[PDB]
């Protein structure tokens, strides 16, 4: 009827970029998830860019838009979700990974070491799988406190209150030569992670990522396999 | 072929008989619930026992608040679209008892100041042609002794249902001629003193928009044109 006469206050904010598609959460001022399709034939190239040349996303309303000022002085890196080095195959592809809508505040040690390693390993799977789908996003995990109750606590940085994830997830969909598809899901804390711990140790059941993140992967995958 | 395996997280709009809702599976709660109150719809024989809430089976069980999440938590199942807005139809009233329409609410707040705000909003149908009501949770930051800002909120039950720190209610007041007035309230999820006049909880709509991630004024301006 006439219920939506004045519109709806919010709807899904999908963004298609050259290198990824993301879903944006204006409450946290960051993406819910970012989706990439890596493959060996559309991976390497001449693209390059300064490691620090990130840009705020003018397609996001200013009330809900993360800025470089939000990160300045916070002690966090602008941690990209869709990695720049996945997309040197075109300058525009690589540039799009520097929208702040594709980054979250990331402990610098993590960004530089164990997360970097995981991104590098993910890229390397294109040498032995036809396609490597990568879905990357934040987590805000509850913890139990000494009063016996459970709470979600996270920092928010800058005037725009950009949320600092407690953890990050990364889901790989590995398309092997002809048909057979394999699923690998990792979680790391937003913390200095020992770079020598084997990445295997950070695998988790996909369902626990689904539960915590509010997202669903397995049903879409079973649906595609039919 | 980027979407070959679908997208893992898109808007969960739900249309019910009494309201439209947008759902957050992360917090296991609505982002907002939108109603249109009119004087006829207040009246009706609809009734329902005050505690008869049902889990929403249109929500994946991983992300679905249940009655057991609330049991023993010390919080009420605080409805967002109020049952009493919808006595005009038993089905309309029934739909307000889906848990997707509720958030953990301090019992005192649900019973007193929030109830009063709901009764007041209902009463504006006597003097406005339409009363639109958008209700939802807030999770507002706080500044700790280190000068940094954090969001902290409890989660209750096995399904970790988020306990909002505050609630917002936006009224769109539509007169015939002279037209549209906007009025927006915020209350902490706390035992608010019921003698505090409701007007003292008015906040600028921009502050709700900033904190909630939602936009109201752009849509309001577009319809005026
Ligand atoms: Cl910029
Ligand atoms: Cl940085
Ligand atoms: Cl990179
Ligand atoms: Cl604390
Ligand atoms: Cl944090
Ligand atoms: Cl595509
Ligand atoms: Cl039930
Ligand atoms: Cl049951
Ligand atoms: Cl209750
Ligand atoms: Cl009621
Ligand atoms: Cl506020
Ligand atoms: Mg990085
Ligand atoms: Mg109530």
Domain annotation for chain B: domains and CATH numbers: 14-224 (3.40.570.10)
For residue B195, the distance in angstroms to the closest alpha carbon of chain A comes to 31
A169-A172-A173 Cα angle (round to 5): 145
Does B8 contact A at CB distance below 8 Å?
A: yes
How many angstroms does the Cα of residue B30 sit away from the middle of ligand 12? 32
Residue of B148, B151, B172 to mutate when probing chain A, most A C-beta within 10 A: B151
Q: Measure CB to CB from residue B153 to each of A7, A27, A152 and give the nearest one.
A: A152
Please report, for residues A13, A38, B56, B115, the alpha-carbon distance to residue B89 in angstroms, rounded to integers and kept in the order given: 34, 53, 19, 21
> For residue A19, what is the nearest residue in chain B, using CA coordinates?
B2
Query: Obtained via which technique?
Result: X-ray
B window 13-32, beta carbon within 8 A of A: 13, 19-20, 22, 24-28, 31-32
SS3 A218: helix
Measured in angstroms, the resolution is 2.1
Residues A8-35 as b or e (16 or more Cβ within 10 Å = b): bbbeebebebebbbbbbbbbbbbbbbbb
Q: What is the C-alpha separation between B213 and A60, in angstroms, rounded?
A: 11
Scanning A79-217, the segments in alpha helix (DSSP H) are: 91-96, 108-112, 114-124, 206-213
Q: What is the C-alpha separation between B96 and B55, in angstroms, rounded?
A: 11
> For residue B156, what is the nearest residue in chain A, using CA coordinates?
A150
Q: Measure CB to CB from residue A220 to each of B6, B24, B214 and give the nearest one.
A: B6
How many angstroms does the Cα of residue B20 sit away from the middle of ligand 7? 20
Residues B77-116 as b or e (16 or more Cβ within 10 Å = b): bbbbbbbebbbbeeebbbbbbbbbbbbbbbeebbebbbeb
Q: What is the C-alpha separation between A174 and A184, in angstroms, rounded?
A: 8
């Amino acid at each position: 009827g006439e219920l939506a006469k004045y519109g709806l206050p919010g709807v899904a904010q999908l963004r298609s970029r050259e290198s990824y598609v993301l879903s944006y959460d204006p409450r946290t001022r960051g993406a819910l998830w970012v989706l990439e399709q890596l493959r060996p034939e559309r991976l390497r190239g001449d693209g390059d860019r300064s490691a620090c040349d990130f840009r705020e996303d003018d397609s996001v309303h200013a009330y809900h838009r993360a800025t470089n000022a939000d990160y300045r002085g916070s002690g966090f890196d602008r941690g990209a979700l869709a990695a720049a080095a996945n997309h040197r195959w075109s300058q525009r592809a690589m540039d799009d990974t520097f929208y702040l809508s594709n980054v979250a505040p990331q402990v610098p040690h993590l960004n530089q070491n164990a997360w970097n390693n995981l991104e590098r390993y993910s890229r390397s799977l294109t040498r032995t799988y036809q396609n490597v789908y990568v879905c990357t996003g934040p987590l805000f995990l509850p913890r139990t406190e000494a009063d016996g109750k459970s709470y979600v606590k996270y920092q928010v940085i800058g005037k725009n209150h950009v949320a600092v994830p407690t953890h990050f997830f990364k889901v790989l969909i590995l398309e092997a030569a002809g048909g057979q598809i394999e699923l690998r899901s990792y979680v790391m804390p937003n913390a200095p992670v020992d770079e020598t711990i084997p990445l295997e140790r950070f695998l988790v059941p996909i369902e626990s990522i689904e539960r915590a993140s509010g997202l669903l992967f397995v049903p879409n995958i079973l649906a595609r396999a039919g």
